[PDB]
Amino acid sequence: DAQMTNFETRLRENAAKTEALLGHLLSGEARADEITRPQNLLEAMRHGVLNGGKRLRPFLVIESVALLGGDAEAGLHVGAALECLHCYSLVHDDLPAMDDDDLRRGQPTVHRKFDEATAILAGDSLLTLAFDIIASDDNPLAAERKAALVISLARAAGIGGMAGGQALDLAAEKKAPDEDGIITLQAMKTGALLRFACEAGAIIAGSNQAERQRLRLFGEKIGLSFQLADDLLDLTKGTLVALRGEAWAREKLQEQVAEASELLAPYGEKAAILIAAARFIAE
Amino acid sequence: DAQMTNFETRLRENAAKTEALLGHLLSGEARADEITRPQNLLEAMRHGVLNGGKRLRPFLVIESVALLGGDAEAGLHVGAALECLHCYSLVHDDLPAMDDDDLRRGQPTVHRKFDEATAILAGDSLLTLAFDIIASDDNPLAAERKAALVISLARAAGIGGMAGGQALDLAAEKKAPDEDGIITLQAMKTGALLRFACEAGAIIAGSNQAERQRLRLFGEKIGLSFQLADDLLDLTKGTLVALRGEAWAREKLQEQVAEASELLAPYGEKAAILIAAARFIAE
């Protein structure tokens, strides 16, 4: 209860910090190497970011970085980058060709407020900007760590990650997947960005391999829990809840929170915020 | 004539080298940090790359790198990355919401051979992969140079570059631009990737600022010539050919080739291939 308040409050704090930097990064002034920023496309990008939700992904980057003693400013920049990518994915998924949504969080979707062309280009531009934000000199982070993050984000986001998962998800609508197929498409469509968010803290902090693996694994448990909790919420069609039942799902959620917590045991009290996130997500 | 053969032959050689690496990079095997590569989406990506054209952009990267004595393997990887990005842009531009093309180079467009969702995701995945290819450890290039390239490519490709130019171009269809507007949207829509292709050689080679600027400027002249030559070809609506006339355009093309050639004068015979490219493009 007090711990759940701890998470909710930090989620809102980190959301506000990330949003402030995002507003700055989406300002109308051309940067070095940019010719001009067309105002309509930029407004569409801002709209896409406005509709992006509660900023869990930046939260996880920021808090992974804090756990491991990395540079909070680098954490904020990488969180913003990751959020831009998350938001691009929603702008494209909302399109008529994909999920065909007129509304997102009570507001018109980007293609409805603008048009489909502008939505396509806004998502394309937000995906592109994510990489700019990570690699830019105003992200105070060594080049080797920037390169590692670019690789990690691209792998998590692309053919073998998020985008591939979306392809598998759409294919699942016409041809029902089996359990192994569901686990795979979920790990890609939603798990990979959450994995990346946590692993990124270790990359940013310059952690050893063991610690980077630990945070990756933690991120995998967060994503597994995120997916189950969401499918349970909707319940109360290729879903593990559908195949295995609600009782199985609720026990597996409980298990994943316990596993997540055990992974961060070695950090003691300093892991409380991330452990609270696991519990919030899972319930 | 013999010089134009020199260019045409090297264009084909570099196209074949770049295509071989692209085929490898688009293989079905999951890489480290990828879960699996869905076969249908991967086929769509390959189709998008197959339809991409004559590989001028990789040619320029490879030859800029050669001019400045950089690592040809790094040149090949960065050229492949740039080509993936170029090809993504075509996959999205062909969509019904944008240019609405059923054919590209005599073949069905990606959304026609597959569907619109798959085309959207294929372009998204090719854009994402471009950044993976640049930053990956199998690109033999120092991290600092990789970061610089990620920034340069993202700036050239995004809101202040290619994507922004496409937005300005679509807006031009409903509201005619003036000359300054045309120059700007052209510099973004087509010039920026050609600028990047040439400047990239200097970044890869670890050139001093002066030399990097020189290759950037050369790339700007290539792009200016590329645009004019193309608009002239079509002639024989917001175009400089339309506003200034064919005679003005043909003289300006000639001027830009001369300027391009003068920029590379200090490299002597070693600049012959790039100078031939300027002449091929312009005529």
Write out the DSSP string of A152-190.
Answer: HHHHHHSTTSHHHHHHHHHHHHHS---HHHHHHHHIIII
DSSP 8-state symbol, B105: T
Q: Which domains does chain B have, with CATH numbers?
A: 1-283 (1.10.600.10)
Which of B7, B4, B161, B9 is closest to B86 using CA atoms? B161
Coil/strand/helix, residue B104: strand
| Chain A residues lying within 8 Å of B121, measured CB to CB | 92, 163, 166-167
Which of B221, B220, B246, B217 is closest to B231 using CA atoms? B246
Interface contact A33-B131, CB threshold 8 A: no
Which of B211, B282, B230 is closest to B252 using CA atoms? B282
Q: Does B97 touch chain A (CB under 8 A)?
A: yes
Please state, in angstroms and rounded to a whole number, the distance separating the CA atoms of residues A120 and B98: 9
Mutate which: B78, B118, B128, B227, vs A, most A CBs within 10 A: B128
Cβ atoms of A259 and A269 within 8 Å: the answer is no
Interface contact B160-A135, CB threshold 8 A: no
Q: How far is CA B109 from CA A98, B89, B189, in A?
A: 18, 12, 20
Resolution in A: 1.6
Q: Does B115 touch chain A (CB under 8 A)?
A: yes
What tokens were used for B145?
């140079």
Find the distance separating the first CA and the last CA of chain B, reported in whole Å. Answer: 12
Cβ atoms of A165 and A188 within 8 Å: the answer is yes
What tokens were used for A142?
């060594």
**Minimal Cα–Cα distance from A71 to chain B, Å?**
19
Contacts of residue B143, defined as CB under 8 A and 6 or more positions apart, other chains included, come to A142, A143, A144, A146, A147
| Chain B residues lying within 8 Å of A101, measured CB to CB | none
Tell me how the structure was determined.
X-ray
Coil/strand/helix, residue A237: coil
- Tokens 């993976």, residue located: B132
Please state, in angstroms and rounded to a whole number, the distance separating the CA atoms of residues B106 and B99: 16
Contacts of residue B21, defined as CB under 8 A and 6 or more positions apart, other chains included, come to B76, B77, B80
Please state, in angstroms and rounded to a whole number, the distance separating the CA atoms of residues B108 and A275: 51
Q: How far is CA A270 from CA A69, A273, A274, in A?
A: 10, 7, 9
Q: For A83, what's the count of Cα atoms within 13 Å in the CB-facing half-sphere?
A: 35
Interface contact B32-A157, CB threshold 8 A: no
Q: How far is CA A178 from CA A114, B6, B169, in A?
A: 39, 56, 45
Please state, in angstroms and rounded to a whole number, the distance separating the CA atoms of residues B111 and A120: 14
Interface of A with B in 41-60 (CB under 8 A): 41-42, 45
Q: How many CB atoms lie within 10 A of CB B274?
A: 27
Nearest CA in chain A to B189: A35
Rounded to 5 degrees, what are φ and ψ at A104? -140, 125
| Residue among B116, B166, B170 whose CB faces A97 most closely | B116
